[PDB]
Each structure stands twice: as structure tokens, then as C-alpha cells.
């Protein structure tokens with residue numbers, strides 16, 4: 001077994017693209033006076049990070065609202081009603097309150113039954129995969145028939161407040177550099193219905209995978225509702241080191257050889273980080289979908305949004321082996337397999 | 341069915357160092373009380389919370405949690421290198437990213453194999469964390485798990501007492517922030533293990549979970565503010581608690597006279613009284629610390645369990661019912677055999 005999941009399936013999947021486009025060109029317009037004062041002559045967003053646009057919601061959209069929208073769409077995709085759901089996990093970085101959980105708010109919106117178990121999982125960009133594993137352990141055992149894993153991310157306030165701080169006459173070069181990665185974040189949402197395979201014999205299978213950690217690096221990227229501070233240089237170097245460890249494990253437990261994988265669904269922090277990742281493991285770039293260029297980094301929703309987009313694009317065929325991979329602040333790294 | 345091979349290897353709590361009495365709070369509120377014409381001591385006489393504990397300045401959730409974790413490892417007689425899973429279940433949190441668990445894990449020096457993340461579910465999350473860990477242990481993924489929880493209410497007291505002493509405060513504003521004045525600081529941590537590793541240790545059997553998520557608006561909390569519909573929350577909270585207990589009677593086979601301790605969420609005197617009379621539970625079998633510690637959120641249940649353990653009270657075979665509940669509303673009831 002190697003503790004891989006048996007008879008756990010993806011019954012439904014969906015994403016929501018946030019409606020309002022914010023271009024790096026617009027951003028650079030606002031920041032230009034500060035660029036000039038600091039003597040920055042390069043387009044650090046568009047050319048260095050490789051981000052050309054990102055999407056935002058309306059101001060009044062909460063994490064629970066975006067998650068609820070994705071969940072209803074996924075329920076339709078699995079062709080089931082909310083009454084079938086025995087577990088709902090919300091995995092987002094964004095959250096409505098410290099208490100109650102965002103999951104309870106989403107569950108109240110959807111109308112789950114009084115038998116439905118709900119809670120949040122938080123773990124930066126890897127939480128959706130953590131949520132899938134937790135649901136999978138219940139599904140494999142047969143405690144429930146169907147689960148929802150949900151995730152809505154809102155970056156509105158971080159853009160609003162970061163831009164104000166950075167266009168201050170008094171902003172220091174250090175603060176500017178520290179906060180710049182915030183302007184690579186994006187809004188979006190995703191949700192997945194997982195099921196016992198017996199109920200959905202033709203659905204994709206989720207096998208799980210492996211995780212490794214380097215929690216001595218927990219200071220590298222710190223975020224709250226209106227601020228994210230990031231050591232981008234160190235994140236890259238230490239992130240890659242951690243992935244290599246995780247890849248050794250993936251080869252032991254998953255039996256992975258890169259040329260035998262059909263798709264790589266990778267969490268994205270920037271264009272150069274992704275290029276370094278791919279170069280490191282000899283991955284065929286044709287096997288790596290990216291949406292960072294126009295959606296930026298959607299935190300823990302990124303992986304399932306990309307998977308959902310691949311499905312919607314017709315890129316996924318029966319029997320395709322799909323690798324889910326990411327490095328999340330912590331640091332953590334998880335790699336898991338789906339067989340379409 | 342129930343967990344078969346899961347034990348509690350170690351357990352610990354931290355009581356916060358500074359006492360804030362209700363008498364001391366009331367002296368501060370008094371001129372607000374004299375305006376508005378309030379002549380009742382709600383905290384002391386009605387809620388029955390006479391004191392709560394605060395941390396030193398700038399103690400973070402992660403610091404409190406790390407403190408409890410080091411104690412719980414000592415209690416379990418294991419080094420951090422044996423921990424394959426660390427879950428942080430606190431309401432309080434350092435940041436949105438990364439997990440507070442990664443910060444505690446960094447403090448402790450966990451290994452590069454150790455899986456970590458947060459579970460958030462108001463005052464229920466410790467029991468949720470226990471069950472998540474239990475499923476991994478049963479499945480052979482790990483040998484030992486830490487479940488940790490540090491709560492800090494310092495800021496909520498500072499900010500709330502500011503608002504309540506404002507010359508503008510109205511009585512309705514006062515009433516819907518009053519519950520914030522029943523919260524308290526503290527921390528707890530638990531080591532869970534595969535039973536073959538720790539044969540004399542208490543067994544955790546798991547339990548049953550019910551929800552009333554239509555009531556998610558009734559208690560809303562951030563670091564600096566908690567707004568609470570006290571009346572409806574007490575009424576619906578006990579409604580769900582009553583339903584989960586009925587479910588527990590069915591699947592765990594529970595009958596009241598056959599349980600030796602009830603370890604319940606620590607809310608208030610009337611909440612407690614209302615629940616205990618529903619099922620004719622002996623109040624002598626229900627340890628309470630809110631009188632002096634207030635409501636410590638999801639850490640309340642394991643803090644009580646730890647105090648019972650340290651009291652040296654419990655005997656082998658004692659059936660201990662863990663009754664958790666949290667804003668949501670969510671309720672979970674589970675059994676430990678000592």
C-alpha cells in the first residue's frame with residue numbers, strides 16, 4: 001500500500017475566476033513615483049516575477065462567499081445535492097473571523113444536515129491537498145459517502161493597503177522590497193466533491209502521496225489580511241532544496257519517473273521559481289500549465305483551480321497520471337497523484 | 341468503527357500568570373454602570389466568572405502553544421524526533437500564513453518528515469484535531485502526534501474595556517460585547533500514540549459529531565473584539581448539546597450513571613447548570629474552572645482533562661466523556677477510557 005488511498009475518487013470539481021482584472025501596468029502607474037525615487041528602472045512585476053495581471057472580487061465578497069460559489073458549482077459537477085455531504089472542510093488562507101470557522105459559514109449558506117462534520121484547515125498554499133487527505137481517510141474507511149473541500153481567497157485588502165503603504169512619501173526601500181510579493185497574489189476559488197469509488201466507478205482516483213517539511217524557515221513569508229512580508233530570494237533557494245527531498249520520497253512511495261507522468265499541477269509563486277523547479281527535476285514544460293501570468297498566486301486554491309482548468313480545457317484523458325505538487329510557506333512540500 | 345488502537349501518551353496545560361478579577365473590572369466599568377443605571381454585577385453574580393488569567397506582554401499564541409507542547413512531550417517521555425504529526429487547534433493565531441503549527445514546530449525542532457497544519461473550529465477544534473490525528477495513527481502513517489493550543493485574550497480585554505469606558509457607549513453595545521469579558525488565556529497540548537507503543541496509557545475511542553451551522557452568526561471573534569448574542573446562543577447551544585448527547589447514548593452506549601467524569605466546554609454558570617439538569621448529571625462529576633479562568637476556548641476541555649490528570653484523581657477504567665462545543669454551531673462528544 002505504502003499508505004496510498006484505496007477507493008477514493010474525485011466526483012466533482014470546479015473553480016471560480018474573480019471578475020475584475022487588475023493589470024501590472026495599472027499597478028506600475030501608481031508605483032512609478034516610488035520606483036523613480038528608489039531608482040528602480042526594471043519592471044519587477046511584469047518582467048522579473050512574470051505577472052501581467054491578477055483578478056479581484058468586489059469589496060463585499062468574503063472568503064465564505066467565494067467558497068460557497070465554488071461549492072455550489074462543484075455539487076452540480078458531481079450531480080449531487082448538499083444532503084449527501086457528510087464532511088465539509090474549508091482550506092483557505094483568507095478567513096471571515098478567528099471564530100467561527102469559515103467552514104461553518106459556508107455550511108450554513110449551503111444548508112448541510114445536522115450530521116455534517118465541518119471545520120477549517122489552514123496551512124498556507126498546501127492546505128487544499130491536506131484537506132483532500134483528511135477527507136480521503138474518512139472516505140476510504142467508509143465513515144461518509146461524500147465530502148466537500150472548499151477554498152475562496154480574497155486579496156482585495158492586501159492590494160488596497162500595500163499600494164497605499166508603498167506609495168507613501170516615507171516608504172523605505174526595505175519595506176518596499178519586503179512587501180513587493182504581495183502584488184503577485186490573486187483572488188479566486190475552488191471546490192471538490194470527493195466520494196467512495198463504489199459510488200462513482202468512472203471518476204478519477206486520488207491516491208494521495210508524500211509530504212516533507214523545513215519548519216526552521218517559518219519566518220520567510222508572513223501574511224495577514226492587509227499585509228504580506230516575504231524573503232523571495234530565500235524562499236526560492238530553500239523551497240527548491242525541500243522539493244528535492246520530497247521528490248526522492250515521491251519516487252519511493254509513488255514510483256514516480258517524470259517522463260511517465262502526463263501532467264504536473266504545480267503551485268506557483270513566480271515565473272522564475274517555476275522555471276527553477278522544472279529545470280531541477282527535468283520536467284517537460286509542455287506538461288506544466290500556468291495561470292500565474294494572468295491570475296497571479298491564488299494561495300491554496302491554485303492547485304485545484306489549475307486542475308479544474310485542465311479538466312475544462314479537455315487536456316485530461318482517462319488513465320492520465322497527474323502529479324499535484326507544491327511548496328507552501330512553513331516551509332512544507334507535498335506531492336500527490338490522481339489517476340484520471 | 342470506533343478507534344481501536346489510539347492512546348493518549350502525554351498531556352499538559354499552562355495557566356496564564358496574571359489574574360484580572362471581575363471586582364477589578366467592575367471598578368473600571370463603574371462610572372459606565374452609574375450612567376445607564378446598571379445595578380447588577382452580571383459577571384460575578386450571573387455568569388459566575390470571578391476572575392480570568394492574562395499573559396505577559398506580547399506572548400503569542402505560538403509561544404503559549406510551544407510552552408504546553410514541551411511539557412506534554414515530557415509527560416509522554418518522548419523527544420520531539422518521534423512526532424510525525426503536529427496540529428495546532430487554537431482560535432488565537434499569529435498570522436493567516438504560515439500555520440501557527442509551523443511556528444510551534446520550528447520552535448520545537450520537529451524533523452523534516454513531520455507533517456504540520458492548523459485546524460480552526462472555534463472551541464471544538466481540539467477534539468477535531470484529536471480525531472484527525474487518531475485516523476492517521478490507526479492507519480499506520482505515524483506513531484506519535486502532538487495536538488497543541490494556546491489562547492490569548494490580552495488584546496480583546498484591552499480593546500473591549502476601552503470601548504466600554506468610552507463616554508459614548510450605549511447599553512446595547514455593552515451587552516453584545518459582555519461575553520468577551522468571560523474569555524481567558526491558557527494553553528494545552530496532548531501527545532497521542534499507537535496503543536502498542538504505550539500499553540498503560542488511556543485509550544481514546546472517538547465519538548459522534550453533530551452540527552447546527554444555521555447559527556454561525558451568533559458569536560463572532562477576532563483578536564481585538566468579540567460580539568455575541570448571549571441569550572440565543574445559550575438556548576441553541578444547549579439544544580445541539582442535547583441532540584449530540586442523544587446520539588452519543590446510541591453509538592457509544594452511554595448512560596449517565598455509567599460515566600465517571602464529564603469534561604465539558606467551560607462557558608458559564610448558567611450554561612453549565614442548564615446542560616447538567618437536562619440529563620440529571622451529578623455536578624460533582626463536572627470539574628469547572630471558568631470561575632477563576634473564564635472561557636479558554638478550544639483549550640478548555642484538554643486543560644480540564646490535564647488538571648484532572650495532575651490531581652491524581654482518576655483510576656484505571658474510569659470512563660471519561662469529552663463534551664466539546666463551539667460557535668458554528670458544532671458539537672462533538674467522545675470517550676476516553678483511563
Ligand SMILES: CCCCCCCCCCCCCC(=O)SCCNC(=O)CCNC(=O)[C@H](O)C(C)(C)COP(=O)(O)OP(=O)(O)OC[C@H]1O[C@@H](n2cnc3c(N)ncnc32)[C@H](O)[C@@H]1OP(=O)(O)O
Pocket residue numbers: 379380382386387463514515516518519522559568570571573574577578581604605606607608609610611612615635663664665666667671
Ligand atoms: C457539550 C458542551 C456543554 C457546554 C455547556 C453549554 C454550552 C452552550 C453554549 C454554546 C456556545 C458555543 C461556544 C461558546 O462558548 S461562544 C461564547 C459564549 N459564551 C457566553 O455567552 C458567556 C457570557 N454569557 C453568559 O454567561 C450568560 O449568557 C449571561 C450571564 C450573560 C446571561 O445569563 P442568564 O441566563 O442568567 O441571563 P438572564 O437574562 O436570565 O439575566 C438577566 C440579568 O443578567 C443581565 N444580563 C444578561 N445578559 C447580559 C449581557 N449579554 N450583558 C449584560 N448584562 C446581561 C440582565 O441585564 C439582567 O440583569 P438584572 O435585570 O436582573 O439587572
